């Protein structure tokens, strides 16, 4: 039942909105960590100190 108040709050209203009274936060990595969307670097320029 500890799991059951989770997974209902998702399918009742919004989940990704930071409620602070009952502390209805989420647990969500940004997708630049689990997924390394790999671009190389956009460099193409020498900058100089």
């Amino acid at each position: 039942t500890e799991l059951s108040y989770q997974l209902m709050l998702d399918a009742l209203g919004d989940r990704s909105r930071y409620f602070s009274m009952w502390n209805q936060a989420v647990d969500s990595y940004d997708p630049d960590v689990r997924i390394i969307e790999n671009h190389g670097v956009e460099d193409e320029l020498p900058n100089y100190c």
Binding site: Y5, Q6, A11, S16, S28
Partner: protein
């Protein structure tokens, strides 16, 4: 530690009627869980694939379906105890959170009622005797969306959340792809590893000798830099006129939700109890199941979290002032 129960100011001539309307034995409130599960764990000891289970034979009166996942032993408490030694881990427990991240490390589902006949339910799927999510080998090709997920599995599952898949396929909706749901998670991917056995000049290197950015990044760690400006060595370029050959290998990404196996003919979400749980065959006898799973060999001790999802409806009322009653029910598996 206190209690902050807000009241509504119902007026005395409309609260006392509400007190004595709901007093009867037919207004008589009823709840249930949202998940409504028979949650029990199963250990995977030390890199083992095949993890069978055989629950003894009993009723299946409006069983709703399976839902499995995976999680580690180190990262999960056993909540039969109010205090849990041999448990030193402190973050995002998958048994409680909705955190789930090992669902992509899973191979097969075989379901056999009475250890006699397999259940797809009268040979629905392509290889009927089992469910195949991970087709690592080529074979003949059942793959979906450039990962190793099979159409064998892409119908039982993608349609279980969304009721989509007999008509067509599309971006499921905007209001049904919840955060603990499937489609927002499912992120297939692929890369190309440079080949080994179609040419001769592939001699791999290990991290003490694997190096580029030489002289500019420190040797084997975030220390200060040292060395020589020097040509790169490790990535065999899959680009341009060098054109080194390459195997393919791919995997998919389904975290944050559990796999679902519905219990129905067309596998759809037509209601609470489907037509399979309603019938006179599953509601009048006892039926075991030799439900064996095979998984990827993982090193840490792993639990297997099958939730046989069954009804969990509680009927409550208050027959007099100061008296509360609650008759529980969880059918099937109707015990502890």
């Amino acid at each position: 530690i206190n209690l902050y129960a807000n009241f509504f100011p119902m007026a005395h001539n409309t609260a006392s009627t509400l007190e004595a309307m709901l007093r009867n034995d037919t207004n008589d409130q009823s709840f249930n869980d949202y998940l409504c599960a028979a949650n029990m764990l199963y250990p995977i000891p030390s890199n083992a694939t095949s993890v069978p289970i055989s629950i003894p034979s009993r009723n299946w009166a409006a069983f709703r379906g399976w839902s499995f996942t995976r999680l580690k032993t180190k990262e999960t408490p056993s909540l039969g105890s109010g205090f849990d030694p041999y448990f030193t881990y402190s973050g995002s427990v998958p048994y409680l959170d909705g955190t789930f991240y090992l669902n992509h490390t899973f191979k097969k589902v075989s379901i056999m009622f009475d250890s006699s006949v397999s259940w797809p339910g009268n040979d629905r799927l392509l290889t009927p005797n089992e469910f195949e999510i991970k087709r690592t080998v080529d074979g003949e090709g059942y793959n979906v969306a450039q990962c190793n997920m099979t159409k064998d599995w892409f119908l039982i599952q993608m349609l279980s959340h969304y009721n989509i898949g007999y008509q067509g396929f599309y971006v499921p909706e905007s209001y049904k792809d919840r955060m603990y749901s499937f489609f927002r998670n499912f992120q297939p991917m692929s890369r190309q590893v440079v080949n080994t056995t179609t040419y001769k000049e592939y001699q791999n290197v290990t991290l003490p000798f694997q190096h580029n950015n030489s002289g500019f990044v420190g040797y084997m760690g975030p220390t200060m830099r040292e060395g020589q400006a020097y040509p790169a060595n490790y990535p065999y370029p899959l680009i341009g006129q060098t054109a080194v050959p390459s195997l393919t290998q791919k995997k998919f990404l389904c975290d944050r939700t559990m796999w679902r196996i519905p219990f129905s003919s067309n596998f759809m979400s037509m209601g609470a109890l489907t037509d399979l749980g309603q019938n006179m065959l599953y509601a009048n006898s006892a039926h075991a199941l030799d439900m064996t799973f095979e998984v990827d060999p993982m090193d840490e001790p792993t639990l297997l979290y099958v939730l046989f999802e069954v009804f969990d409806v509680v009927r409550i009322h208050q027959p007099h002032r100061g008296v509360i009653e609650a008759v529980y029910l969880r059918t099937p598996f109707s015990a502890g």
